[PDB]
Amino acid sequence: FSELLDLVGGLGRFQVLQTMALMVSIMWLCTQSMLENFSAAVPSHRCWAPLLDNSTAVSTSLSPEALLAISIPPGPNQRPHQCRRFRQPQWQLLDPNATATSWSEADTEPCVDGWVYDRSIFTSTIVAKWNLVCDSHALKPMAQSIYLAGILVGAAACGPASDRFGRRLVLTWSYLQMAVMGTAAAFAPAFPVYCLFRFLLAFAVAGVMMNTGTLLMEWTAARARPLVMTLNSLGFSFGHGLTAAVAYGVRDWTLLQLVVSVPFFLCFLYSWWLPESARWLIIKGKPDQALQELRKVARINGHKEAKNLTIEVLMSSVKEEVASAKEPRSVLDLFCVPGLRFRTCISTLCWFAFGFTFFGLALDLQALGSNIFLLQMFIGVVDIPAKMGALLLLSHLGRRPTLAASLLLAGLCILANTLVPHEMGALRSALAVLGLGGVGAAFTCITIYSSELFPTVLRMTAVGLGQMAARGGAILGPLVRLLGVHGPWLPLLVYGTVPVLSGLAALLLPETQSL
Ligand SMILES: *[C@@H]1O[C@H](CO)[C@@H](O)[C@H](O)[C@H]1NC(C)=O
Ligand SMILES: O=c1[nH]c(=O)c2[nH]c(=O)[nH]c2[nH]1
């Protein structure tokens, strides 16, 4: 096939502009996923209480600190209880002779009158709007799980639709669905409706993710294809910085969600000026359309050959593909072949670990460091050099040691985060950033390495199964935080154990760089 790209220009003005255009979309698409660090931030809260909040009642000369001690009991964390209040004001607790033994839990009641939230950092969040606290506290990670499950279902449905209707058409309606569903989520009236719209937004996120990469690869000559995949992967790196930059300015969740959604109307509008994949149009037996959209690109790249492209040349240049690209093999074949079964197991585990660890940690920055805006920005800034170093070492040291070393870097940093005491917040934050950097490097590493461990007929099958495994791991990511009742160390130990085991496992793979 690529002989045609050499008539049309296989790297040039069109591929440059297409890479820029799709990278920008991937940036905003990354903001959509990272948003719920900020849209769903948990502000500090307490029960509403008469002496503190009933401004219509008779006031007193006591200070707010004293009235808080008189109204809200202390909780386990040596801070005011987030889910209880005194049944009657505890005037007895003001005198210096008082002790903690002076009251008992029967003297307290739950927040009958609802909660009061700290508005200093964020003006509003979904947690503050729908009271996703105390007995409802599980509902935040449930919302994140529903989003990531939406992406799983969307990726499962994308394949058949992408193959039947085309890369660009599905990408176009994915952009429209992202805009519409993000705008709808921004104005949802109730929590179930918000979950429905976030699910339907994720369903389109999957389509954008898959089709952008597929279309970039299908329009790029082979010498530049790894570089193009790397640039498309740096799109997310800049997406992290963009998330921090936008969320630092917009402190209301409705306005923030709307702001990050609206750009996709423009993405929808400019996607119509992209060409549908020529490989797809030829494979589906539509030469008259493939010729048009090839010489359209030849016009952009500035070639005289737009006069030379002709149907007979177009047909003669792709004689093999239409005659042989007819093997949509089932996933089970990977397990049927004795040799490939165990390689498939290990590579699928390496895909799983990325999603599990990354969307375990990256979606609760509030636990990792002092300032989530700056920490998100750093998760971008450190992701970039990690990815470039991954590409280079992947090109020199071999895929096996680079995959193993990246995953072991991630695991060791995330585990060490549990050894460093809570007082050393700076080192905890730095280790968390480095761990997410290692995971993000392994993302590129595995994307390329899994495309070599299997014979060329089953290469694509392995990559698809790996992607589904990463999505299954991402879904479990958020739910693992529900173990945190037993301690803050436990979710971190789990998230750190997974990459350690998978990184050790990657050592058992064969090397695929030339030896
Ligand atoms: C708040 O104060 C007003 C003052 O008139 C009173 O009528 C009302 O019952 C009070 N409510 C609570 C919950 O203290
Ligand atoms: O390096 C990444 N950063 C992300 O924020 C992200 N989100 C995603 O779905 N895949 C990736 N990869």
From Swiss-Prot:
Changing residue 292 to E: In some gout patients; uncertain significance. Detected in kidney (at protein level). Detected in fetal and adult kidney. Detected in epithelial cells of proximal tubules in renal cortex. Changing residue 159 to S: In RHUC1; reduced urate transport. GO terms for molecular function: PDZ domain binding; urate transmembrane transporter activity. N-glycosylated. Changing residue 279 to G: In some gout patients; uncertain significance. SUPFAM superfamilies: MFS general substrate transporter. Keywords: Cell membrane, Disease variant, Glycoprotein, Ion transport, Membrane, Phosphoprotein, Transmembrane, Transmembrane helix, Transport. One of its GO terms (biological process) is cellular response to insulin stimulus. It holds the Pfam family MFS_1. CDD domains: MFS_OAT (cd17374). It is found in: Apical cell membrane. Glycans are attached at residues 54, 97. It comes from the Eukaryota. It is a multi-pass membrane protein. Electroneutral antiporter that translocates urate across the apical membrane of proximal tubular cells in exchange for monovalent organic or inorganic anions. Involved in renal reabsorption of urate and helps maintaining blood levels of uric acid. Mediates urate uptake by an exchange with organic anions such as (S)-lactate and nicotinate, and inorganic anion Cl(-). Other inorganic anions such as Br(-), I(-) and NO3(-) may also act as counteranions that exchange for urate. PANTHER family: SOLUTE CARRIER FAMILY 22 MEMBER. This is Solute carrier family 22 member 12. It comes from Homo sapiens. The gene is SLC22A12.
